[PDB]
Write a protein that binds this ligand. Structure first.
Ligand SMILES: O=C(O)CCCC[C@@H]1SC[C@@H]2NC(=O)N[C@@H]21
Ligand SMILES: O=C(O)CCCC[C@@H]1SC[C@@H]2NC(=O)N[C@@H]21
Ligand SMILES: O=C(O)CCCC[C@@H]1SC[C@@H]2NC(=O)N[C@@H]21
Ligand SMILES: O=C(O)CCCC[C@@H]1SC[C@@H]2NC(=O)N[C@@H]21
Lengths: 124, 123, 124, 123
């Protein structure tokens, strides 16, 4: 769909069981079959499980630029994701929304893979 | 392999018709069959082609932490990759950064990045 | 005092009056007359005025390292500051606390200067 | 001066007795008597002394935005400074980064950084 973009990423599929979060990250390149922003975002963060599951992230959004403009190519920010209807695999897998109203649909594989789609409330 | 970790990511497979760079990113979770650092790095940047191609990145390395220690969970840095080992034109290939880490990547026609990463530091 | 560190920074002393925040930043080097962490944090952000005044920031915390360890010298994060008892000068000047329970006492000067003290709830 | 902006910051004035670098940071708000970009940059990094001294930094450039646009308010990058114009040992002096910007700084004995910054880009 016009609003959805592919994501792929990785997570720690054998996380510590000592109270620590589960490290993960993913990337969206902002091209789909409808639009192309010539940019890519990576989110790096951790999954915090339980009934009030969260994925807390920081992100880097790099736009393709000329070399002369490369100094201003990368935005930084932070997103917190809340799971709709809340193992790390089962914990992460599902639909999530962030504070902007963006939506993150993800499946976590047994091998550490993250796959899914992202819809941003802003940009593009 | 002991020192290699899986990566995946995405890149702009139809970059602007105008001298831009090609936006991209990828992730490594630092677990393999030998070690687990309970952490993940994402690199965000752009590929700059030509005679001496480069991938210029900034990265975020998040470690799993308690919520109380989350304030100190994330390192930030910057890596520049070239194909010079301390080659065909394009992103696909073997790249090395300023630390001597090895990034071996395949770029699929429709935007996928897949490969392996071997870090010269950490773990 | 043992818990307090000097800060200095700068703010836009003639900000846009079009709904935009007021850009600012400051630095703490984590040495006082009691402790030295051999590190420094910079906060970069904006002041959002009104009765529910906020300073929203991202920060970089660099520790002194050897060259071999420089790759792991810098932490990144984000702090949101709430004003205790809420011009940009008057708006910014006061006592603020962040989500960690740290406290930021600042005076904004007519020339764009920020001066004050910082007490961190964590680290050191 | 038209192209110079005020900076202040702080540095560790008693760095570790052990080969560390000296942690430091500074801020420029991009308002002077000529222009106002409604933005501020902070540089966080460390000074590495010796024969060819360096200040290695990462920076955050926040622009004043509406709250709705705050997600895109902050650029991040990295600057490396040397004293080579495109000198006495220490932080105090005139430094240049890879963009050709000029950072003129005085380091006070007890941790103050003061000076001016002229950017080769932006504004
Ligand atoms: O405009 C672009 O270049 C592409 C869209 C970027 C949207 C960003 S990604 C980080 C932040 N979190 C979101 O959910 N949306 C924005
Ligand atoms: O120690 C860890 O938590 C995992 C290894 C991290 C290595 C980092 S990733 C960013 C930087 N670039 C590299 O090539 N290595 C380091
Ligand atoms: O441990 C250190 O190296 C010095 C103290 C660092 C405390 C950091 S600064 C960013 C974050 N916000 C706070 O209020 N405290 C932490
Ligand atoms: O355009 C602006 O908002 C103000 C000028 C910003 C210039 C930036 S600061 C980080 C980077 N390093 C430099 O020397 N210049 C750019």
């Amino acid at each position: 769909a016009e609003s959805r973009y592919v994501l792929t990423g990785r997570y720690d599929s054998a996380p510590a069981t000592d109270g620590s979060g589960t490290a993960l990250g993913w990337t969206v390149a902002w091209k789909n079959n409808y639009r192309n922003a010539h940019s890519a975002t990576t989110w790096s963060g951790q999954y915090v499980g339980g009934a009030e599951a969260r994925i807390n992230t920081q992100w880097l959004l790099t736009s393709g630029t000329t070399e002369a403009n490369a100094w201003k190519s990368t935005l930084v920010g932070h997103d917190t994701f809340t799971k709709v209807k809340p193992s790390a695999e089962a914990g992460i897998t599902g639909t999530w929304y962030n504070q902007l109203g963006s939506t993150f649909i993800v499946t976590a594989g047994a091998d550490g893979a993250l796959t899914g789609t992202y819809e941003s409330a802003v940009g593009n």
